[PDB]
Amino acid sequence: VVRSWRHMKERYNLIGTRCKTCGKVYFPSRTVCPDCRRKGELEEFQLSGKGKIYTYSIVYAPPKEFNKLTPYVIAIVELEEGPKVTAQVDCDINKISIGIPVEAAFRRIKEDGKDGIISYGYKFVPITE
Amino acid sequence: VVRSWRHMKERYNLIGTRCKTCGKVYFPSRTVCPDCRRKGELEEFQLSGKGKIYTYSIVYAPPKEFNKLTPYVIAIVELEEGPKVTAQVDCDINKISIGIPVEAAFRRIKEDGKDGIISYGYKFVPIT
Amino acid sequence: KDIGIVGYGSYIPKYRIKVEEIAKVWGKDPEAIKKGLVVNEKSVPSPDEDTATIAVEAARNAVKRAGINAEKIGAVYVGSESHPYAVKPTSATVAEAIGATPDLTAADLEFACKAGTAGIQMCMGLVGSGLIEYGMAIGADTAQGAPGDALEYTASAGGAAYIIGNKKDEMIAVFNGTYSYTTDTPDFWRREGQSYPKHGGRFTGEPAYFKHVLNAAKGIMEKMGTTVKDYDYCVFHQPNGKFYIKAAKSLGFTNEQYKYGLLTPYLGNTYSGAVPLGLSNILDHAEEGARILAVSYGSGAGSDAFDITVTERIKEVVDKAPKTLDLLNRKKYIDYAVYVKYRGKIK
Amino acid sequence: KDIGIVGYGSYIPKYRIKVEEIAKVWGKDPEAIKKGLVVNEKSVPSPDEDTATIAVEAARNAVKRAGINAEKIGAVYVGSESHPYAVKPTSATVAEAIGATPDLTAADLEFACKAGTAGIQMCMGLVGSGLIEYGMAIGADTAQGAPGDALEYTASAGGAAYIIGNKKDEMIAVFNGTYSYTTDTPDFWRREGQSYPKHGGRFTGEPAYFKHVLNAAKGIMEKMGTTVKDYDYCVFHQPNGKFYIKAAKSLGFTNEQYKYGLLTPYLGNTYSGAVPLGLSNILDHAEEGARILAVSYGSGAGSDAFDITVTERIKEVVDKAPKTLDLLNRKKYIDYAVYVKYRGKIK
Amino acid sequence: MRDVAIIGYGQTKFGELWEDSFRDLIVEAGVKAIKDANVDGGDIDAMYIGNMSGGLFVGQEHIASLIADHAGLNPVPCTRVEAACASGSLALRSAVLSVASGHHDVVLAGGVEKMTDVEDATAAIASASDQEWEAFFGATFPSLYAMMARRYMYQYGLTIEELSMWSVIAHENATKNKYAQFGFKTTLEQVMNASPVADPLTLMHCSPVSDGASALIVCDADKAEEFAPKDEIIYIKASTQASDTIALHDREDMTTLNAAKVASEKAYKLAKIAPEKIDVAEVHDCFAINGLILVEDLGFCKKGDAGKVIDEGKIRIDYDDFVTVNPSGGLKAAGHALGATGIRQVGELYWQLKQDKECKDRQATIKNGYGIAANVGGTGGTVCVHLLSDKR
Amino acid sequence: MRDVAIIGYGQTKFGELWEDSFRDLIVEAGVKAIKDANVDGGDIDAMYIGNMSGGLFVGQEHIASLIADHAGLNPVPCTRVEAACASGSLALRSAVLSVASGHHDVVLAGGVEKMTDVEDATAAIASASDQEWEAFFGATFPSLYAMMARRYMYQYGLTIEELSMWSVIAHENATKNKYAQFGFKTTLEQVMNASPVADPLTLMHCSPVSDGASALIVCDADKAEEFAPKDEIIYIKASTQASDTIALHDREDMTTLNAAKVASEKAYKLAKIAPEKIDVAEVHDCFAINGLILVEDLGFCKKGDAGKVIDEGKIRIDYDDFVTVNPSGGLKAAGHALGATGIRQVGELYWQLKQDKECKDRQATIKNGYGIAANVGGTGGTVCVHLLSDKR
Numbered sequence A: 001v002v003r004s005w006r007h008m009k010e011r012y013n014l015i016g017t018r019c020k021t022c023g024k025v026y027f028p029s030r031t032v033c034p035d036c037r038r039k040g041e042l043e044e045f046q047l048s049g050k051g052k053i054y055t056y057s058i059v060y061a062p063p064k065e066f067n068k069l070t071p072y073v074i075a076i077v078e079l080e081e082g083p084k085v086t087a088q089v090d091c092d093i094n095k096i097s098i099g100i101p102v103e104a105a106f107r108r109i110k111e112d113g114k115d116g117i118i119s120y121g122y123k124f125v126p127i128t129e
Numbered sequence B: 001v002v003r004s005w006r007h008m009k010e011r012y013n014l015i016g017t018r019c020k021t022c023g024k025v026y027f028p029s030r031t032v033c034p035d036c037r038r039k040g041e042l043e044e045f046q047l048s049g050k051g052k053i054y055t056y057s058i059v060y061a062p063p064k065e066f067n068k069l070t071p072y073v074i075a076i077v078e079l080e081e082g083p084k085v086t087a088q089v090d091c092d093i094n095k096i097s098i099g100i101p102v103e104a105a106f107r108r109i110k111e112d113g114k115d116g117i118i119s120y121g122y123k124f125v126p127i128t
Numbered sequence C, D: 001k002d003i004g005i006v007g008y009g010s011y012i013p014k015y016r017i018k019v020e021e022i023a024k025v026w027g028k029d030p031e032a033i034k035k036g037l038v039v040n041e042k043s044v045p046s047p048d049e050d051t052a053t054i055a056v057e058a059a060r061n062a063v064k065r066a067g068i069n070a071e072k073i074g075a076v077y078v079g080s081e082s083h084p085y086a087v088k089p090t091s092a093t094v095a096e097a098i099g100a101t102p103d104l105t106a107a108d109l110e111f112a113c114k115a116g117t118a119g120i121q122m123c124m125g126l127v128g129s130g131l132i133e134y135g136m137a138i139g140a141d142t143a144q145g146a147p148g149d150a151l152e153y154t155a156s157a158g159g160a161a162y163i164i165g166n167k168k169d170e171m172i173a174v175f176n177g178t179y180s181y182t183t184d185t186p187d188f189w190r191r192e193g194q195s196y197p198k199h200g201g202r203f204t205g206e207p208a209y210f211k212h213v214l215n216a217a218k219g220i221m222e223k224m225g226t227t228v229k230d231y232d233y234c235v236f237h238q239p240n241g242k243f244y245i246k247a248a249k250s251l252g253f254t255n256e257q258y259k260y261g262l263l264t265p266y267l268g269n270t271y272s273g274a275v276p277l278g279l280s281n282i283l284d285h286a287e288e289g290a291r292i293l294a295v296s297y298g299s300g301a302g303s304d305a306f307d308i309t310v311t312e313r314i315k316e317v318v319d320k321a322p323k324t325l326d327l328l329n330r331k332k333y334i335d336y337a338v339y340v341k342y343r344g345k346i347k
Numbered sequence E, F: 001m002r003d004v005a006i007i008g009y010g011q012t013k014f015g016e017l018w019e020d021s022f023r024d025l026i027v028e029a030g031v032k033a034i035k036d037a038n039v040d041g042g043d044i045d046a047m048y049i050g051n052m053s054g055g056l057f058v059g060q061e062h063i064a065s066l067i068a069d070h071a072g073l074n075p076v077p078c079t080r081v082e083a084a085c086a087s088g089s090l091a092l093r094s095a096v097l098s099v100a101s102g103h104h105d106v107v108l109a110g111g112v113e114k115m116t117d118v119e120d121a122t123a124a125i126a127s128a129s130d131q132e133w134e135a136f137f138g139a140t141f142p143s144l145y146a147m148m149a150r151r152y153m154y155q156y157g158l159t160i161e162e163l164s165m166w167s168v169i170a171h172e173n174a175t176k177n178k179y180a181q182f183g184f185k186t187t188l189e190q191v192m193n194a195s196p197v198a199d200p201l202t203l204m205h206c207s208p209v210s211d212g213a214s215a216l217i218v219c220d221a222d223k224a225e226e227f228a229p230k231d232e233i234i235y236i237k238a239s240t241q242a243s244d245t246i247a248l249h250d251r252e253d254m255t256t257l258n259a260a261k262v263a264s265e266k267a268y269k270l271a272k273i274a275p276e277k278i279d280v281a282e283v284h285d286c287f288a289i290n291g292l293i294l295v296e297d298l299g300f301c302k303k304g305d306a307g308k309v310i311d312e313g314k315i316r317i318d319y320d321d322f323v324t325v326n327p328s329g330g331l332k333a334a335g336h337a338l339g340a341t342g343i344r345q346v347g348e349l350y351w352q353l354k355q356d357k358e359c360k361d362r363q364a365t366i367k368n369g370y371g372i373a374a375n376v377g378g379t380g381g382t383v384c385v386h387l388l389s390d391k392r
């Protein structure tokens, strides 16, 4: 609920930060730059959802809530700006491999039971090309 | 939900341990005696449910699950044998005071929602 | 100048239940609740009443004040949190019940307690664009609070209806402008399955209700180039009297400016009827040339702001239908048992 | 002065289920169903997709075609029969996901299968009145057919979004006029409690669907002074292919006029997304100066009719996002077991 | 066993901080403490973090790694210490022992909490009590302290009017504190006629659930001189800790916190000081009774009597002769951010003995140059005492 | 900076323990350690315990107070340290740093875990990962380590057959361990054709969820001669700790644990030893790939050629001219009690370097008298390294 509310623009729109001192792009957005610390000047930066599979795994026995999705692809995607993210990939388990170009998609990531909040966010999909 | 299963004989039947080195009784049952520790051995002992109000409080705003019982009397009861326990007391909030004699009763203490396990245990009732 | 209210109407059911009657059952101090929430009692619909009937009563009263033939109404919108059907629309029933059918458009609106005013904006657009001549917007609800919960003290039944027109001779009030502030916020919600809602507790206040109400109030006053001194009366969303007053005081409104808008202490929270009912009571008392600030709020996070000016034609129409305050004082008290019976809170 | 569509977009999930797969389970003749309903297969949403995600995909594709900054979108309306929350609005999530927040109005529209087109009219009014520069109207749904019922063969998932602007240089299509026919009709409904709807059977057809669709089509053509000969293409509501064609043929439309609008045979009934999706496919194929007749229908007793003309700017934008037909043919078939798993039809 | 000193203190405002995420808080505290210490991030050799909630609030364990990662201080070692309400004190004490050992010269002891992230904080706070034998039967945290206060009144004749006065002086003091959760005054009638939580306690006898972070920079006394001027250095004379029964019903005497008696007398022994020398103190007043009892257990009064003398003055900046306790609102009015409270208590003594600009409006009169802080975990199962001085 | 040594070590059985209550586990480990240590309970100045779970299963925080209370050692201070799977070593390191300071002479460092009580342990174990940015999206703990394994294979050409060889050695070694969860041998085909948890890992590449407890007794090197004979005293040369990014997707290189490289290097520097001198090593092999990677990061071989090292069998107990790794079953076969594992690893080195009767059947050949342990929290966000020697 409250935690969902804070990182919505990140999960929904992939909005990270850019350090002008470095030039480096960070996602998720950081409050303190790991290199420059207080010196780093931060501006909000909108990432494109485009990225490539850096590594991946297929989850065969997940929590009871992911029963419909089983087996699913979890992966670490290297985005074209540089940041890496962990997310699921909507594709057949035989079609996934390292280096596959993917694109972020707005999906229903979770729900807090029958009565709680629904949590949306990014899930990657392979590009048509 | 194995935790409930282990302390059933205590919650249900009020079975503690008696130290044969000391002679004193401790409830809940202890694995290691605080006075003897390693040089003390333990045997099972059934306590009488009889005890007296050592202290008490009236809970006016409890968790959503205790909505029906609000306001309720929570108390620490000194049992005849010596050990003290904290439990609720089934009485009018105006009738409770320190020193009141009470007796343990088997009651439905809590439930894990509408689908989970029901947890029974002791609650205290005043004597005639 | 182009767009304005030509008619307004309101309805409140007769049954009430005092805070004392609810607190008694749940083992709470009534004076603590009353002081805390700033609420004394609330409206209870009869078992033969619902959001549709309430909407119809209010719609019919608005037509009386408008003094126009309902055949001229080209859109009916009903904003509610408690539409009787999940699929069949309330607005269609209200249209049939006022004989506006069949040459019109309609839709049922959902946006928590902001739904009623959402439709006012929709009617403003359609009349202003020339797509219709008159539009009706209704905010009505038969709210249900969870038996043990605090929302039980406020959740209530009521509704008010507004007819929007283009004719200076028929306008009793004029829209100077509208503004809306909307975000995605999980402060309060109800999932399709559940009968009673779930809330975030203290997260509902500062970060949601105040954030959106005050931003919308500041946005409209920025849009109009206006200050708190320029407005004669104000109405805010009133989940309880506490929130309403804090917001009014925060913006710099005096009791004389906000008193007419605040009905919750004796009516409760009618959700989508709340601000519409408040605004209707302001219009029952208002004089020509009075400027009103009206800001609504909806969970999921939204607020609609209005800048309205009252016209010469106001006193002509007020007595054409029942005054909000008269409906509010024609009442019959009930105990909790009868209340749970009426509400179908019985299993 | 002139109102028109500046951008449109659409989304269809990848999963399908053939009639044959459903019939097999329930002991029915697939060829009989296919012939009767004029339907071959339908779209099935992924378990991680819902009306909100579908609306967001559409909305995002409409923004690409519009080529405008979403900060300029003044209201977002989402018309659905399957909004994820009973109280929290979808349109806010959509607004947040396209970055139109916070300076906007939004509302979630309910009117069976006509809620989508209801919001187009709302955006038409607000833009035309000058209250907003751009408004977005979405029609999306993840429909539910009862397991044993015939609605299981058609009820499907899909969405389309439309952005409305005033500026001629940005418009790809122009509204010549709109008309609506609405009554109170108990042909089909769903009570708040129930997960699956109830219908009146044969009473749904002639007295309800045809009555409202044909009256609205006749009404628009009277308003605009047209004839079936004046229109280049047409799109009607398509609960099944049978009803759609009957209506088209009844008004005198040839196959060449109605073929693009009819998607149900391979898509199913996407309820609030049906005509929006059909209209989007017409726009994907349409040439400059084409006149479209679009008539929607909603179970409660509603129909919205549109008279649209296609502009020069059409070929510029079509390829800026996925064509409706491309989404429709990018598909993966599933059996009935998988389908009931995905849709949560399992208890 | 080298001597340890405080060379910096930093703190966020305590309260309902919705915008300020968890990360924003431990940065704000950490950067503030770094500036005050006048050290660079690279000078931090290690970190010790106090968090009571942990996973229960937000679902997250291994917060130390998270905190170090986001602070941008990897690969410095980061450790989480836990002891319910007195986790900040225990992280200060772990930090003190790592500097004393010689392994680290500069260590950061911080504490953070974010309880406004969960719908019901009551369930997490109750986690400090015995789940099986207290919580299970419906013993809420306020009801446990209300039961202590009842027994105290029964044994020593404390009245509700006397007990209430603690909250009036707390809220008066908190108005001079910009970092306080509550900056308003109250009367005795307002405290007593507040909504009751657990008889005899009312809402105004209880500390609130609050977000907030606070951080100290401890340093070797020899190294401290290099980093800061002697004037602004405050030395840690004693950092003691003791334990008691987790359940209140297992205590020999409920009206006292033995672990506080044990820890405080150990701290007075190493400092070679008596309680009569303490100028200022910061005690765990999550409830009004807990403040009274600690005043007695730290030896500022005899058992029973602190309740009497609290009334008609004393423990105010106004009172000249007597120790001053909780110059900031205390837990009650300044706020109680569980893991950070222990750190905050000490960071107040630092300011008070330092005569810092931060506490200029609430500056206590410092004659001997000594201050003590009592941090309690749960109902007394853990107590951690820290004794500070202006002189080494 | 006093030198620290270990006088004793006590360990419960590991795994599905239904009969043993939580209090019986800590007692059972504590009493066994006390017997080996030959100290009386009164001789313990302080207890340091680390628990990652923190009654996530139980619902109980303030575990330290509870443990001391039930142990009957009140009012001795007891503290809880937390760092996910590394909570044990961190409790040990905290215990070492207090002894080194001189504030305590005899300290107990213990670890205990109960995961059988909850129906789904998966949710708690995942707590070590970033909840907002890994767990949230469905990244299970085995899937994170499977993603490490995948990238390692992609970069260094490791095959599934090579990786599976790590398990057969572990299970072979575990048959010589009475406290091990699994006392059976397995083949390469059995490991590869086991039920898959997360591709490429199968059930036989993962450590199991398990209950248990282990406690060490640390004392000053000088005082150690009072309680124990010189030949049964093992000396802690250095206790190092480092940090890394909590999320795997934030690492500079996934195939390596920098926090292990950092901590191991610092430990070799203080001991003035090279990795070629280490006779026996205990590494965190929760997912086998974690076993390969730590062998490289502790400097026993170069990056990439870990697969060759095991497929040959260099690390086996029968092998002579190379370091013997995880002679006890290890996390894979001995079992993985999160809080107790960090202690258990060191207690094995203790037994191996003192040629104890406990590891008679799995006794490694000790040439130089050195052993290293590497405990890891989560995916590597925290690593704690302990280096032990028979000679001071």
Ligand SMILES: [Cl-]
Pocket (backbone or CB within 6 Å): A037, A038, E040, E041, E042
């Ligand atoms: Cl810095």
Ligand SMILES: [K+]
Pocket (backbone or CB within 6 Å): C086, C110, D086, D110
């Ligand atoms: K609805």
Ligand code: NA
Pocket (backbone or CB within 6 Å): C086, C087, C088, C089, C090, C108, D110, D111, D112, D300
């Ligand atoms: Na409807």
Ligand SMILES: [Zn+2]
Pocket (backbone or CB within 6 Å): A019, A021, A022, A033, A034, A035, A036, A037, A040
């Ligand atoms: Zn930088």
Ligand SMILES: [Zn+2]
Pocket (backbone or CB within 6 Å): B019, B021, B022, B033, B034, B035, B036, B037, B040
């Ligand atoms: Zn004994």
